[PDB]
RNA sequence: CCAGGAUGCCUAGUGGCAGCCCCACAAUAUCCAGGAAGCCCUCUCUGCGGCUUUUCAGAUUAGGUAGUCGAAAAACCUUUACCUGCUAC
């Protein structure tokens, strides 16, 4: 049971977008969630918490489950998902499908001196959400994953292998910081190092090259 | 709770089948505005609800606190107010 809607979705069906870094460099939308797992098969989904919510009622009360996932692998891709259902299972699974949606590249870098291969951010990246700011500055080789542990989860989740972490403001909003880990991962890349100095050609896009393929007949 | 005594226009009425034969509408004041039962009240013929109580309890309920109700001797004519109770795959 596939069948895609989204002209990228149907690309993806035929076979003639590959990997998820194409779909990066044309930061083309991912709406349908199936895409994801067609490129990469080494999604691990770790659900970090769920708080019960509760809106008031003018008898008792509406109970729902807000149910935070992190998606991950070791490749340099994460996810983080978020949901609020009141089956708990259901709610868990939509919070994952958000993860795979979302799944965002990590710019991977060198400690100091490349050596051997990168495990590492590459720059002092920080984030934001609420009153948490997650700054990772870049660690040396073996040192670890210096976080709280849901960020630690996260780290490891991404790939990256060493870290050193800042959560400040109030970390115990655990969906906030994990959101703002997200954004620090995010803002990676983006940040402008001498090594992207050099220009680039512009690639025409897939959905600009095999656009008969995609679109229903 | 009470009633009219008379200075008076009253007026021998006007209406609806006046006709005597019933219906309704028309006669200022009233001088008194006065009498009877009840009348602020205090001792009696010396009443039944107080005085404490001691016994308990009915209970009052989700649990509990403080009061209240019921059966036994001594002068005097509310069953409510208030505290404390529950969570993920």
Redesign the pocket.
């Known amino acids: 049971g596939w069948v895609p809607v989204t002209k990228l979705g149907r690309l993806v069906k035929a076979g003639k977008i590959s990997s998820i870094e194409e779909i990066f460099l044309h930061s083309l939308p991912v709406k349908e969630f199936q895409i994801i797992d067609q490129l990469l098969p080494n999604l691990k989904d770790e659900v970090m918490?769920?708080k019960?919510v509760q809106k008031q009622t003018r008898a008792g009360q509406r109970?729902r489950?807000k149910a935070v996932v992190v998606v991950g692998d070791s490749n340099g891709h994460v996810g983080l998902g978020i949901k609020t259902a009141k089956e708990?299972?259901g709610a868990?699974r939509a919070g994952i499908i958000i993860a795979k949606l979302s799944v965002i590249p990590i710019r991977r870098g060198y400690w100091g001196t490349n050596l051997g291969q990168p495990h590492s951010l590459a720059t002092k990246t920080s984030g934001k959400c609420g009153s948490v700011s997650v700054r990772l500055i870049p660690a040396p080789r073996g040192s670890g994953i210096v976080a709280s542990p849901a960020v630690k989860k996260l780290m490891q989740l991404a790939g990256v292998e060493d870290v050193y972490t800042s959560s400040t403001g109030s970390t115990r909003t655990l969906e906030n910081t994990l959101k703002a880990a997200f954004v620090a991962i995010g803002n990676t890349y983006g940040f402008l190092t001498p090594n992207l100095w050099e220009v680039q050609a512009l690639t025409p896009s897939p959905m600009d090259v095999y656009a008969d393929y995609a679109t229903a007949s």
């Open positions: 918490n769920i019960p109970t489950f708990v299972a868990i």
